[PDB]
Every structure is written in structure tokens, then in C-alpha cells.
């Protein structure tokens with residue numbers, strides 16, 4: 001019952017910051033595999049009528065024998081679903097969260113530096129996040145497909161630092177990928193996620 | 201200080217099983233970074249004079265202020281040092297450990313099936329291993345740069361399943377990379393590691 005969402009732009013739309021080949025394989029193979037395996041895990045359980053956000057927020061209540069499959073593949077589905085919507089060929093560094101970041105870090109650039117440092121320091125596979133914890137902004141990273149929702153922090157920006165997300169264009173140069181990412185951040189979607197969670 | 205060992209072959213030697221671009225970056229960037237960071241962690245400490253095998257076996261006793269850096273970068277140095285010597289352009293599927301595999305699994309094919317299954321199922325970054333555990337052969341996987349020595353098991357074959365090890369040639373197709381690996385396994389090195397197992 002979970003479905004692979006179409007990208008909200010073309011595979012080529014994020015060039016030259018993220019290559020078309022990566023956008024295609026990352027979406028049509030990696031994300032698709034998470035959807036297939038999530039559906040196999042939840043099929044015939046009462047997870048199958050729940051939102052992915054409810055499942056990932058409540059992984060501790062997922063039946064023991066499927067909890068790892070749901071953590072990994074449910075996490076994969078939520079994280080990539082967020083990621084596609086958080087990218088745009090028309091990125092503008094403005095809006096409510098940019099203003100909150102400038103207030104807290106003193107500048108957007110100082111925030112980008114801390115986010116880049118944490119994203120680079122995430123050893124192995126995982127994600128770098130800006131989260132809202134009970135109205136407050138924090139940078140965190142997670143391993144594999146873990147999502148801050150599970151820890152009661154609402155993600156409003158995420159960067160995939162699995163090597164599949166950057167290896168074809170950047171190989172070992174994760175810092176260059178992180179630098180490229182700023183050019184395609186959908187700050188409108190960041191604002192939408194923040195606004196939804198500041199009053200929830 | 202720890203040093204980056206040269207490969208025993210050129211970057212093209214494992215073509216067309218593993219691509220030259222990967223061998224170059226994997227060795228001269230990824231492994232090199234582990235050595236740099238390991239040396240920074242152990243420099244001027246009681247660890248500096250210890251073998252990387254003794255250090256990784258005994259991570260439990262590494263001071264907390266450097267334990268993560270030694271785990272990740274010490275593991276990275278040991279794991280890649282093993283990996284380069286366990287690959288060859290002149291693979292021959294025979295010897296002491298092939299015979300011992302058949303005594304456990306019944307066939308090399310049955311061993312390869314279990315190895316491929318565990319290697320494919322390792323979620324995120326890590327390694328698939330054949331180990332000696334109190335004289336018995338077992339397949340295990342580890343996350344990130346963790347190594348079976350830390351659990352008192354002796355690694356005798358390892359496959360890197362970090363995406364950097366296979367993405368340029370195989371992209372998402374980790375199973376095709378695992379299949380290609382068999383063509384370049386150095387079973388003489390496997391035998392050497394087995395014969396030395398403590």
C-alpha cells in the first residue's frame with residue numbers, strides 16, 4: 001500500500017549540483033527497494049493502514065520480528081520522500097527558517113558550516129538533519145535510515161550522506177557534495193515542515 | 201607511525217572485476233585518510249608501539265577520548281590492509297581453507313551462497329567476513345570499520361561492502377559486485393591468515 005512518489009522535478013533538474021544518473025538510480029532503484037521491502041514487512045499487519053510518519057515515530061511499538069525491516073525500509077521510504085521534496089532547481093536562501101537560523105547561528109553561513117561539519121563527520125551511512133525539538137532548532141545526524149522523528153524531533157531539512165547519494169559525481173569528496181547541496185535546498189519546503197511542527 | 205601499504209598490483213590489475221578508478225581512490229584516498237587519522241589518535245600514546253591487530257583486538261581498553269577514532273580509523277587501516285592482500289589477478293580456488301570450507305558447508309558453492317546472502321543483508325556500511333572462531337569456520341558481517349578480532353574471532357577473508365567499494369562500476373547492484381569478488385580472491389592469503397589463527 002506504500003507507493004514510490006514521483007520526483008517533483010525531472011531527473012536532470014538539479015544539474016550540475018546532483019547528476020541525472022544518480023537522481024534516476026537513487027529514486028528508481030534505492031527508494032523503490034525501500035518501498036517494496038516496507039510493503040513486504042507491513043503486509044497483513046495493522047501497520048499497513050498507518051502513515052509512514054506514524055510508523056517511524058513509533059518504531060518501538062512495531063512487532064519485534066519485523067522491527068528491523070520496518071526501521072530500515074520504513075526509514076528509507078520516509079527519508080527519501082522528505083529528501084526529494086527538500087530539493088529544487090529554484091533554491092532561494094530566504095524565509096521563516098532562514099530568518100530563525102540567522103538569529104540562532106548569527107548567519108546562514110555559520111549554520112551551513114556547522115551542518116557541513118556534522119554531515120562530514122557522520123561515519124559510514126546516514127543522514128544530516130535540521131530538526132525542530134519543541135520549537136527549538138538543532139543540527140543532528142543519524143546512522144543508516146534512522147530518522148529523528150523516532151526521537152521526537154521533527155526533521156525540516158535532511159541531506160543523504162550514504163555514498164550512493166554522491167559517489168558517481170563526487171567519489172570520496174563528501175564535502176564538495178555537501179557544498180553543492182546548498183544550491184538546491186528547497187527552503188519553501190523547510191518552512192512548510194517547520195510551520196507544521198511549530199504548532200503541533 | 202602507521203603507513204599506507206602499497207597495493208601488491210597496479211590499479212588496473214583487477215579489471216574487469218574491480219575498476220581502476222575505484223582501486224586508485226579506494227587506496228590513495230579512503231585508506232590513506234584512515235592512516236592519517238589513526239596516527240593522529242595514537243601518536244605519543246602507549247598504542248603507538250602496538251600492532252594494529254593488537255589495538256583492534258583490544259579496543260575495549262582504549263581510553264574513551266580516542267576510542268571512537270581508534271575503532272573507526274584503526275579498523276579502517278586493518279580492514280583495508282587485509283583487503284588489498286586478499287585480492288589478486290591470479291585467483292585459484294584451492295588450498296587449506298577451500299578444503300576446510302567443504303568440511304563445514306559441503307561445497308565452496310554453498311559457502312559462497314551464505315557469504316553472498318550475509319554480505320547483501322549488511323544494511324548500510326560494513327564488511328562481510330569468513331572467520332575462525334575457536335577452530336571453526338563462520339561467516340559474520342560487521343558495521344562500518346568494526347573487525348571480528350574485537351570479538352575474539354580471526355578474519356581470514358573480508359569483502360568491503362561500503363558503497364565506495366562498488367558504486368562506480370556496479371551502482372546499486374551489490375550482488376553483482378559480490379559475484380565479481382570470487383574471481384579475484386587470493387586463497388593463498390586466506391590460507392596464510394587461517395594457518396596463523398590463534
Ligand SMILES: [Mn+2]
Nearest residue numbers: 030160162165
Ligand atoms: Mn539514499
Ligand SMILES: [Mn+2]
Nearest residue numbers: 230360362365
Ligand atoms: Mn573501503
